Enzyme design. Structure first.
Site, PDB file in Angstrom:
ATOM      1  N   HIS A   1       0.808  -1.208   0.000  1.00  0.00           N
ATOM      2  CA  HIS A   1       0.000   0.000   0.000  1.00  0.00           C
ATOM      3  C   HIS A   1       0.853   1.275   0.000  1.00  0.00           C
ATOM      4  O   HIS A   1       0.285   2.367  -0.121  1.00  0.00           O
ATOM      5  CB  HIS A   1      -1.023  -0.015   1.139  1.00  0.00           C
ATOM      6  CG  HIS A   1      -0.451   0.230   2.503  1.00  0.00           C
ATOM      7  ND1 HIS A   1      -0.429  -0.737   3.485  1.00  0.00           N
ATOM      8  CD2 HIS A   1       0.096   1.341   3.049  1.00  0.00           C
ATOM      9  CE1 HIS A   1       0.102  -0.228   4.586  1.00  0.00           C
ATOM     10  NE2 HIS A   1       0.438   1.030   4.342  1.00  0.00           N
TER      11      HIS A   1
ATOM     12  N   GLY B   1       3.157   5.546  10.287  1.00  0.00           N
ATOM     13  CA  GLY B   1       4.500   5.289   9.813  1.00  0.00           C
ATOM     14  C   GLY B   1       5.125   3.962  10.241  1.00  0.00           C
ATOM     15  O   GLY B   1       6.252   3.672   9.823  1.00  0.00           O
TER      16      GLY B   1
ATOM     17  N   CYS C   1       4.167   0.955   9.405  1.00  0.00           N
ATOM     18  CA  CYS C   1       4.005  -0.134   8.446  1.00  0.00           C
ATOM     19  C   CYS C   1       5.353  -0.598   7.914  1.00  0.00           C
ATOM     20  O   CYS C   1       6.273   0.194   7.690  1.00  0.00           O
ATOM     21  CB  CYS C   1       3.078   0.288   7.297  1.00  0.00           C
ATOM     22  SG  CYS C   1       1.374   0.336   7.864  1.00  0.00           S
TER      23      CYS C   1
HETATM   24  C1  LIG Z   1       1.164   2.123   8.016  1.00  0.00           C
HETATM   25  O1  LIG Z   1       1.024   2.641   6.723  1.00  0.00           O
HETATM   26  C2  LIG Z   1      -0.182   2.417   8.693  1.00  0.00           C
HETATM   27  C3  LIG Z   1      -0.120   1.949  10.204  1.00  0.00           C
HETATM   28  C4  LIG Z   1      -1.386   2.262  11.033  1.00  0.00           C
HETATM   29  C5  LIG Z   1      -1.575   3.787  11.196  1.00  0.00           C
HETATM   30  C6  LIG Z   1      -2.088   4.006  12.628  1.00  0.00           C
HETATM   31  N1  LIG Z   1      -1.700   2.762  13.338  1.00  0.00           N
HETATM   32  C7  LIG Z   1      -1.290   1.750  12.459  1.00  0.00           C
HETATM   33  O2  LIG Z   1      -0.942   0.664  12.832  1.00  0.00           O
HETATM   34  N2  LIG Z   1      -1.258   1.690   7.999  1.00  0.00           N
HETATM   35  C8  LIG Z   1      -2.451   2.292   7.616  1.00  0.00           C
HETATM   36  O3  LIG Z   1      -2.679   3.472   7.853  1.00  0.00           O
HETATM   37  C9  LIG Z   1      -3.522   1.422   6.913  1.00  0.00           C
HETATM   38  C10 LIG Z   1      -3.379   1.575   5.367  1.00  0.00           C
HETATM   39  C11 LIG Z   1      -4.417   0.805   4.564  1.00  0.00           C
HETATM   40  C12 LIG Z   1      -4.272  -0.691   4.738  1.00  0.00           C
HETATM   41  C13 LIG Z   1      -4.316   1.097   3.050  1.00  0.00           C
HETATM   42  N3  LIG Z   1      -4.834   1.887   7.358  1.00  0.00           N
HETATM   43  C14 LIG Z   1      -5.151   1.896   8.672  1.00  0.00           C
HETATM   44  O4  LIG Z   1      -4.429   1.388   9.528  1.00  0.00           O
HETATM   45  O5  LIG Z   1      -6.305   2.491   9.053  1.00  0.00           O
HETATM   46  C15 LIG Z   1      -6.352   2.852  10.411  1.00  0.00           C
HETATM   47  C16 LIG Z   1      -7.582   3.721  10.756  1.00  0.00           C
HETATM   48  C17 LIG Z   1      -7.450   4.205  12.227  1.00  0.00           C
HETATM   49  C18 LIG Z   1      -8.301   3.277  13.044  1.00  0.00           C
HETATM   50  C19 LIG Z   1      -9.199   2.598  12.081  1.00  0.00           C
HETATM   51  O6  LIG Z   1     -10.149   1.905  12.374  1.00  0.00           O
HETATM   52  N4  LIG Z   1      -8.755   2.855  10.769  1.00  0.00           N
HETATM   53  C20 LIG Z   1      -9.453   2.312   9.615  1.00  0.00           C
HETATM   54  C21 LIG Z   1     -10.504   3.210   9.003  1.00  0.00           C
HETATM   55  C22 LIG Z   1     -10.410   3.526   7.654  1.00  0.00           C
HETATM   56  C23 LIG Z   1     -11.344   4.348   7.035  1.00  0.00           C
HETATM   57  C24 LIG Z   1     -12.392   4.891   7.764  1.00  0.00           C
HETATM   58  C25 LIG Z   1     -12.491   4.592   9.123  1.00  0.00           C
HETATM   59  C26 LIG Z   1     -11.555   3.759   9.735  1.00  0.00           C
END
Ligand SMILES: *[C@@H](O)[C@H](C[C@@H]1CCNC1=O)NC(=O)[C@H](CC(C)C)NC(=O)OC[C@@H]1CCC(=O)N1Cc1ccccc1
Lengths: 300, 297
Positions: free
Chosen positions: A39, A141, A143
């Protein structure tokens, strides 16, 4: 008795920063390949329904900025395996440890090296939950942070971090890019299935507390395996198998408490509570120590 | 919240083994010096009431076997500083990080890299208790394992392990060999332990940051009045340094430290009344103000 992570130095030497567009996360640099979550190639808009093969074919090697410390590594090729991107670089990592890629089972434990911008920030022990989440500590950050075990000089990588769920637990993949659990690398709020408690681990921990002189929760009773398992499932505890009972043998011998005698103690705790007492410091039954973990730490 | 250790690689790169006769423990190799507990020079019979000064006179450089893995490091000098031995070696450790030696205060947390025969086994977070002990997971051969914190790329070494007390907790020194607490490296009881007030307040700040603030009240207290109450509940009195290290969390939440003290005082006097904070009825005291900021950010 202490939740202990593996020493992280062999993994630290593999962590790099990967940037695509305005997205930065971590990568794992082994020999001449950098592994990271795919991603990283998504924009704000892509993330709701990313057609990854279509997005990836539109990328060039030079769209990927990889940095190891101060040095930039030149990407000379890329490929996708499930939800991981594999960036071929023109430099070999001389700090590459002996390693393998494994897929862990629920109930097994591993160490996480939490990283930000390619820099290691902390290390802690996690378990793969029965519902295939992990109760981690991961911020924006993080990931591409990885989870691992170490045996002799070999690092067994089992986890790469991709997302946080609305309940605050975390989900990710193995190093083949296959998620643990029913999760998808799209920017949506995703719920996990009902979690359960890792029963074989709670029993290992109870034995650890005995080994450390704490025995208030023991009792003179026993239970059959099936009757225990009926009560366990009632309380959203995982079934205990005969393999688990076998696995617990060493801790049973050591303390001279039969496995099914400890099961009767745990049954009493589930039905009666802890009455305000604590075990090994905890007001709660701890289920992220495996039998091996307890023995490894009562051994050196 | 999890106990989170610092990545241990910079410290792994400094661990060696030091043997005198059949006694092997761990040492710390920084530049051209190896630091280790002086009781490596003791036999069991000396461990009763060792005369360390006499024992050290009978020693020569060639009695010390220092090894990084199976590679011997030649000892070219030796001296004693308090309860640590300093072995000058003929090779500067190429993996020496930026470092310093710090003496920490009770309540502060640090990472322990548990080691046996110079090889790391595990890393975990410890808090220095007010009675100057830690709850480690140390077995035979663990002495010379160190505790540390990492700031930017500087390793602050704060602890070296020496012994286990009757009650199963652990005692040791700083890297200048001065014991934490009143303990001595011989054949002792830990003072009765108390709750680490400054860390409980950090934990209440953490709860507020996460929107769990039912326990905030409209009142304040002086530091003296709070300290006198806290001691009746087996809580540590606060120092001025504790007030200062709560500053960042106070500013993040806008809750003056002394106002939080008044909220804590009410919890102590009245109890939780069946409620929880951050999901627990128990107040956590092993997360420092720095730990909280580091995990919330
Ligand atoms: C690394 O890129 C991040 C790590 C996360 C950020 C905060 N804590 C983590 O572990 N990964 C991401 O942001 C993910 C990326 C997608 C797979 C493409 N997305 C993600 O982690 O989403 C987190 C948010 C915050 C809590 C939650 O429930 N959430 C999902 C969401 C998405 C859309 C609408 C509402 C909630």
């Amino acid at each position: 008795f202490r939740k202990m992570a593996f020493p992280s130095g062999k993994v630290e030497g593999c962590m790099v920063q990967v940037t695509c567009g305005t997205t930065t996360l971590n990568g794992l640099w082994l020999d001449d390949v950098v592994y990271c979550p795919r991603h990283v190639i998504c924009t704000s808009e892509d993330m709701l329904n990313p057609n990854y093969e279509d997005l990836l074919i539109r990328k060039s090697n030079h769209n990927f900025l990889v940095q190891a410390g101060n040095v930039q590594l030149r990407v000379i090729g890329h490929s996708m395996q499930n939800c991981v991107l594999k960036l071929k670089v023109d430099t070999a990592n001389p700090k590459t440890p002996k390693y393998k890629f494994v897929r862990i089972q629920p109930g097994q434990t591993f160490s996480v090296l939490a990283c930000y911008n390619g820099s290691p920030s902390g290390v802690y022990q996690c378990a793969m939950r029965p519902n295939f989440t992990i109760k981690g500590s991961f911020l924006n950050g993080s990931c591409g942070s990885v989870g691992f075990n170490i045996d002799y000089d070999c690092v067994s990588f089992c986890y790469m971090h991709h997302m946080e769920l609305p309940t605050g637990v975390h989900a990710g993949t193995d190093l083949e890019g296959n998620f643990y659990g029913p999760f998808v690398d799209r920017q949506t709020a995703q719920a996990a299935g009902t979690d359960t408690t890792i029963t074989v681990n709670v029993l290992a921990w109870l034995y650890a507390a005995v080994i450390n002189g704490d025995r208030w929760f023991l009792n003179r009773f026993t239970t059959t395996l099936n009757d225990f398992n009926l009560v366990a499932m009632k309380y959203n505890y995982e079934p205990l198998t005969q393999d688990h009972v076998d696995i617990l043998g060493p801790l049973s011998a050591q303390t001279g408490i039969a496995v099914l005698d400890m099961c009767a103690s745990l049954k009493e705790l589930l039905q009666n509570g802890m009455n305000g007492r604590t075990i090994l410091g905890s007001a709660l039954l701890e289920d992220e120590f495996t039998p091996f973990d307890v023995v490894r730490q009562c051994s050196g």
